[PDB]
Amino acid sequence: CNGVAGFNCYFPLRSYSFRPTYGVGHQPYRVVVLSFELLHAPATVCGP
Amino acid sequence: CPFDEVFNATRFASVYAWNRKRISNCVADYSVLYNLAPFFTFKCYGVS
Numbered sequence A: 001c002n003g004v005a006g007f008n009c010y011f012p013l014r015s016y017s018f019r020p021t022y023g024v025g026h027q028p029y030r031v032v033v034l035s036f037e038l039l040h041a042p043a044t045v046c047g048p
Numbered sequence B: 001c002p003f004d005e006v007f008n009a010t011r012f013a014s015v016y017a018w019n020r021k022r023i024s025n026c027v028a029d030y031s032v033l034y035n036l037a038p039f040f041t042f043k044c045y046g047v048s
């Protein structure tokens, strides 16, 4: 595709274009994932 | 299954009489949908 757009040459990114008007199942959601590792170690972090 | 006669058609239909076709019980080859010409628009929504 020599770095130019065309058939079978698609740019692998897409946009959302959120507007306050879409339905309840289409608005953006904010997601955070917490990962632990419960093993044997100096145990740097834990609670009160 | 035939996509030739729906694309290589001499006479087409008006916008208010848009032509209908149903296709079932066949094997669809969507690769030979490439040489319709140099430059055409190919956009699909829902699937890659």
Ligand SMILES: *[C@@H]1O[C@H](CO)[C@@H](O)[C@H](O)[C@H]1NC(C)=O
Binding pocket: B004, B007, B008, B032, B033, B034, B035, B036
């Ligand atoms: C019929 O349509 C196909 C669609 O790709 C095209 O390749 C083919 O050349 C057409 N037939 C003729 C005789 O041009």
